[PDB]
């Protein structure tokens, strides 16, 4: 009996920590200077709510003319991890267009996604309050989480929550 595979796409402005969160989930260490242009896909066998499954994760990078793989992942993506950085209001503001574009490509009014405020270790440099991130997520009726790839806070939980959202769809 084959386990279900979930295709997940991590999106967000450059520098928010898409690679660092994805590499923390897969390899369980914190990267500091990962190439901002590398667009890799990753796999991981996990159990979520005690149902084993496979995660198929595209770690998007840059906004150059997309590869055919990115376009396929955008069309076939089952859940989206929409990442901003709590120290960058600009990265949160860009989330609104990431959601429009996901809903545009998927051609539906609602697509499983989670709003992730990353770098929650940078409390000194916080621009986006938790309350404001919760307000965006409540407005879009999506789950919300603050994460730290650096301090390993809620990394697995963010991905697992996205799977729980897909399973409710
Ligand atoms: N303090 C802190 N820095 C982070 C965190 N996540 C990523 N970074 C840093 O932010 C920079 C960009 O991270 P990266 O994952 O490459 O962002 P990406 O362009 O979305 O892939 C890197 O230097 C990371 O060390 C975090 O949770 N906390
Ligand atoms: Mg990256």
Automatic annotation (TrEMBL):
<protein>
    <submittedName>
        <fullName>Ras protein</fullName>
    </submittedName>
</protein>
<feature type="binding site">
    <location>
        <position position="150"/>
    </location>
    <ligand>
        <name>GDP</name>
    </ligand>
</feature>
<keyword id="KW-0547">Nucleotide-binding</keyword>
<feature type="binding site">
    <location>
        <position position="19"/>
    </location>
    <ligand>
        <name>GDP</name>
    </ligand>
</feature>
<dbReference type="GO" id="GO:0005525">
    <property type="term" value="F:GTP binding"/>
</dbReference>
<keyword id="KW-0449">Lipoprotein</keyword>
<keyword id="KW-0479">Metal-binding</keyword>
<dbReference type="InterPro" id="IPR001806">
    <property type="entry name" value="Small_GTPase"/>
</dbReference>
<dbReference type="InterPro" id="IPR005225">
    <property type="entry name" value="Small_GTP-bd"/>
</dbReference>
<feature type="binding site">
    <location>
        <position position="59"/>
    </location>
    <ligand>
        <name>Mg(2+) 2</name>
    </ligand>
</feature>
<keyword id="KW-1003">Cell membrane</keyword>
<feature type="binding site">
    <location>
        <position position="118"/>
    </location>
    <ligand>
        <name>GDP</name>
    </ligand>
</feature>
<dbReference type="InterPro" id="IPR020849">
    <property type="entry name" value="Small_GTPase_Ras-type"/>
</dbReference>
<keyword id="KW-0342">GTP-binding</keyword>
<feature type="binding site">
    <location>
        <position position="18"/>
    </location>
    <ligand>
        <name>GDP</name>
    </ligand>
</feature>
<keyword id="KW-0472">Membrane</keyword>
<feature type="binding site">
    <location>
        <position position="119"/>
    </location>
    <ligand>
        <name>GDP</name>
    </ligand>
</feature>
<feature type="binding site">
    <location>
        <position position="19"/>
    </location>
    <ligand>
        <name>Mg(2+) 2</name>
    </ligand>
</feature>
<feature type="binding site">
    <location>
        <position position="31"/>
    </location>
    <ligand>
        <name>GDP</name>
    </ligand>
</feature>
<feature type="binding site">
    <location>
        <position position="17"/>
    </location>
    <ligand>
        <name>GDP</name>
    </ligand>
</feature>
<feature type="binding site">
    <location>
        <position position="15"/>
    </location>
    <ligand>
        <name>GDP</name>
    </ligand>
</feature>
<dbReference type="InterPro" id="IPR027417">
    <property type="entry name" value="P-loop_NTPase"/>
</dbReference>
<keyword id="KW-0488">Methylation</keyword>
<dbReference type="GO" id="GO:0046872">
    <property type="term" value="F:metal ion binding"/>
</dbReference>
<dbReference type="Pfam" id="PF00071">
    <property type="entry name" value="Ras"/>
</dbReference>
<feature type="binding site">
    <location>
        <position position="19"/>
    </location>
    <ligand>
        <name>Mg(2+) 1</name>
    </ligand>
</feature>
<feature type="binding site">
    <location>
        <position position="149"/>
    </location>
    <ligand>
        <name>GDP</name>
    </ligand>
</feature>
<feature type="binding site">
    <location>
        <position position="37"/>
    </location>
    <ligand>
        <name>Mg(2+) 2</name>
    </ligand>
</feature>
<feature type="binding site">
    <location>
        <position position="121"/>
    </location>
    <ligand>
        <name>GDP</name>
    </ligand>
</feature>
<keyword id="KW-0636">Prenylation</keyword>
<comment type="similarity">
    <text>Belongs to the small GTPase superfamily. Ras family.</text>
</comment>
<dbReference type="GO" id="GO:0007165">
    <property type="term" value="P:signal transduction"/>
</dbReference>
<dbReference type="GO" id="GO:0005886">
    <property type="term" value="C:plasma membrane"/>
</dbReference>
<feature type="binding site">
    <location>
        <position position="20"/>
    </location>
    <ligand>
        <name>GDP</name>
    </ligand>
</feature>
<feature type="binding site">
    <location>
        <position position="32"/>
    </location>
    <ligand>
        <name>GDP</name>
    </ligand>
</feature>
<dbReference type="GO" id="GO:0003924">
    <property type="term" value="F:GTPase activity"/>
</dbReference>
